[PDB]
């Protein structure tokens, strides 16, 4: 039964494998209102799709953690969580219980999180300069509509600098807000 739960997620696993990355591809999903909606972000596509499998909803609720608390990683969480089930099939065939499999990931998670502090070479000074914001914003805008990341970088970096108030040596009070930036489109 543990294999059938992975096969149900495997049906939607290959869809997210082609999402993340600048060369990724987009899937068409027809909305229930009779309107074609296509997007790269998986958190939006998973809401419009009808999923009757409860095991898949676990990754759907885990995807919302990437969409809400963070601004990136919606396509990454579906690829990582989907692969952990495929590599776990080798231990299930050998007769290993799911306890040591889960316990092995918990011991390996603390080893990985400890090394992430040593993986940082450079640090952003948070200058909020127009040229400095282009470094953080460019990779987030990327992996969608490849080739337009150079023009869209100057549009986002200029709008964020306007929202951020001028202050120094104060990190207690938050400044930026998500809803403070509204985007308009006209054909």
């Amino acid at each position: 039964q543990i294999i059938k739960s992975i096969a149900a997620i495997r049906e939607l696993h290959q869809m997210c494998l082609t999402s993340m990355g600048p060369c990724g591809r987009n899937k068409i999903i027809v909305n229930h209102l009779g309107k074609i909606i296509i997007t790269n972000d998986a958190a939006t596509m998973l809401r419009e799709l009808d999923i009757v499998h409860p095991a898949v909803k676990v990754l759907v609720m885990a995807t919302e953690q990437q969409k809400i608390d963070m601004g990136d990683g919606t396509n990454l969480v579906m690829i990582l969580a989907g692969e952990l089930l495929n590599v776990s099939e080798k231990l299930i065939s050998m007769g290993l219980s799911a306890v040591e499999i889960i316990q092995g990931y918990n011991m390996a998670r603390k080893f990985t999180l400890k090394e992430l502090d040593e993986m940082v070479v450079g640090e952003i000074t948070d200058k909020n300069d127009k040229n400095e914001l282009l470094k953080m914003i460019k990779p987030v805008i990327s992996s969608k509509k490849y080739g337009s990341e150079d023009i869209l970088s100057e549009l986002v970096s200029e709008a964020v600098s306007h929202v951020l108030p001028v202050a120094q040596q104060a990190g207690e009070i938050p400044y930026f807000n998500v809803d403070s930036i509204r985007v308009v489109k006209i054909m």
Binding site: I124, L152, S180, I186
Partner: protein, 194 residues
Amino acid sequence: ETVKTMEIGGDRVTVFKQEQGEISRTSTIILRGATQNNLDDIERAIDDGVAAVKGLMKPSGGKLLPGAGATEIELISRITKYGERTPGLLQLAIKQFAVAFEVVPRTLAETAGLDVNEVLPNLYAAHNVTEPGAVKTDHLYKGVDIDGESDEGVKDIREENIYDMLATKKFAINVATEAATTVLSIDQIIMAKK
């Protein structure tokens, strides 16, 4: 200060803006294009783009790590080192824990039209070298190149100023482990006809 009417996209619309006084925290990004479907993704890309600004605060907002397959391959060498270091039955789960990270560079090679037999052995030889010294040298920044240009191989991802923020990568690992933990912890399900 200023209320005017300008033509945006071919139609006359009344614009609401200011200049200096009465500092406001609300901004608007104007977009134009012929295709209606392409304007939806660009609008949603900005919402995901500005959401990364929230992650620039005190909780590890300045730290960064190289992306595009650079970090995922380098972490494999560190995980396999801890496999033989930790005795017991955990050696089987630690080795499979590093192999599960090979899917990220594999999808980048498949979605780019590159061969699976090409990118994978080139990334291992780039991040694994013999250096006569304790301090690591050469370049650990080698990522997965889009290719389709230049000549052959990959290149430093720092040339294009593309990287993954630590707040995004570190928080994604905890979510990925808890997501697969719930599935592996459920050995039985009971459903009904719907």
